Design a binder for these strands. Structure first.
Ligand SMILES: Nc1ccn([C@H]2C[C@H](O)[C@@H](COP(=O)(O)NP(=O)(O)OP(=O)(O)O)O2)c(=O)n1
Ligand SMILES: [Mg+2]
Ligand SMILES: [Mg+2]
Length: 430
DNA sequence: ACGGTCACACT
DNA sequence: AGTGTGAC
């Protein structure tokens, strides 16, 4: 009991933008605002794939990955913003740049880890101690947490959601012992205050609304963030974990969404995260491996040690395009032209990256898929990247994958390529 | 015909 | 260096 480590050492927040691509388009185009809206790419095929959905639109059942034509059936008045197309492919520059706006603001408060284009993890442990020191035996007002939810509260002895939020928050605050600096719950609470400030700054400065989860680790922070979206932040305490995890589907936990989560469910015959507590660390390790087993054992107990990496920028800069079914490239000239298009966009992004971030990519990775292959990549190959030259990069990429072309004629390409991928990696200071 | 990107574990 | 999984 005295020696058991509860994973309450850190205060971690995950801030995730609400329907991010939609918001970027909405900010730029006021007409989209407060309306059922979605962002689509490649309009020609079935109206284009939906990649982002406004909350008004989600009410109609519109979802990501839905074809726009299908979405229209559910929501006749659905408004659509198209992903920019450059050189015959979708260009995500606007959203990347919008992401930078958010990331830079967040970086002001603490070192951040860029988990995705629209979200980043924040370790507020240092910030919290300092803030706790700044306010002395200073009780924390509810006003400082206007958008905060306390998961699991209210409990025990208004049918409006805001009323519920307030009751829960009040129960939490009344419970709090302000005087003790060490208390994890107090630390989470102060962390929540900062997140409120972080989120207000984001909205004021970009016009983008976001949600956040405050907890002692990344997994819990991420899970918490989703609980009260949109435009709200949720504090998941260590104590709330048992009840929260008791009915929490295993797939919900980050990294348990795929095969591992399925095997975990299949092998152990359980549905909920909480049920994982019944197994010894060794038991979990035997089925899912040493690293996974330890992670699962600690995680179902609300404990995770994965640190918030200090990484604001992406480690890689990549361009890729799919050429599905009939559109697969079956000629050498075709492959070369598309490689060139990818290389050109990559070059523009690489050049801007070098100026902005003082770094150069020393390695080029070329990936392709042949028709009928199961795998996302038929082949992956890498060559040195010494110049930010689109022609050289595309020329080099062709050299690397050219032998994949079986056909004797060599003016043709067989099998036709379903996918082309170019990625710049191994960045170095410059 | 569930696209375009990213990170990272395993080998 | 290459492959596969998971995420968003
Ligand atoms: N499969 C996916 C998932 C997300 N994205 C993009 C579009 C999203 O707007 C953006 C952020 O992803 P997301 O946070 O998981 N969902 P989104 O931000 O749109 O809505 P929220 O549920 O977070 O409020 O990345 C994508 O392009 N392809
Ligand atoms: Mg989001
Ligand atoms: Mg996200």
């Amino acid at each position: 009991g005295p020696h058991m480590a509860t994973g309450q050492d850190r205060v971690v927040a995950l801030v995730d933008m609400d329907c991010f691509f939609v918001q970027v388009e909405q900010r730029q185009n006021p007409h989209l605002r407060n309306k059922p809206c979605a962002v689509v790419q490649y309009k020609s095929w079935k109206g284009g794939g939906i990649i982002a959905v406004s909350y008004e639109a989600r009410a109609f059942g519109v979802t990501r990955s839905m074809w726009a034509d299908d979405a229209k059936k559910l929501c006749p008045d659905l408004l659509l913003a198209q992903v920019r197309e450059s050189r015959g492919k979708a260009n995500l520059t606007k959203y990347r740049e919008a992401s930078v706006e958010v990331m830079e603001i967040m970086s002001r408060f603490a070192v951040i880890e860029r988990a995705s284009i629209d979200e980043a993890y924040v370790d507020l442990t240092s910030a919290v101690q300092e803030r706790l020191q700044k306010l002395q035996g200073q009780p924390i007002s509810a006003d400082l947490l206007p958008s905060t939810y306390i998961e699991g509260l209210p409990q025990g002895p208004t049918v409006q959601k805001e009323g519920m939020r307030k009751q829960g928050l009040f129960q939490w605050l009344d419970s709090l012992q302000i005087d003790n600096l060490t208390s994890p719950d107090l630390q989470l609470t102060v962390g929540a205050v900062i997140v409120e400030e972080m989120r207000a700054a984001i909205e004021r400065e970009t016009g983008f609304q976001c949600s956040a989860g405050i907890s002692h680790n990344k997994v819990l922070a991420k899970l918490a963030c989703g609980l009260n979206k949109p435009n709200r932040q949720t504090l998941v305490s260590h104590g709330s974990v048992p009840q929260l995890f008791s009915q929490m589907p295993i797939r919900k936990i980050r990294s348990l969404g795929g095969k591992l989560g399925a095997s975990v469910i299949e092998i152990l015959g359980i549905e909920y995260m909480g049920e994982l507590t019944q197994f010894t660390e060794s038991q979990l390790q035997s089925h899912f491996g040493e690293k996974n087993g330890s992670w699962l054992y600690a995680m179902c107990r609300g404990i995770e040690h994965d640190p918030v990496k200090p990484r604001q920028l992406p480690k890689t800069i990549g361009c890729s395009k799919n050429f599905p079914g009939k559109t697969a490239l079956a000629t050498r000239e075709q492959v070369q032209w598309w490689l060139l298009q990818l290389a050109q966009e990559l070059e523009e992004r690489l050049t801007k990256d070098r100026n902005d971030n003082d770094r150069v990519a020393t390695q080029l990775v070329v990936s392709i898929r042949v028709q009928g292959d199961k795998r996302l990549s038929s082949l992956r190959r890498c060559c040195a990247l010494t110049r930010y030259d689109a022609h050289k990069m595309s020329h080099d990429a062709f050299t690397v994958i050219k032998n994949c072309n079986t056909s004797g004629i060599q003016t043709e390409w067989s099998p036709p390529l379903t996918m082309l991928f170019l990625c710049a990696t191994k960045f170095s200071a410059s």
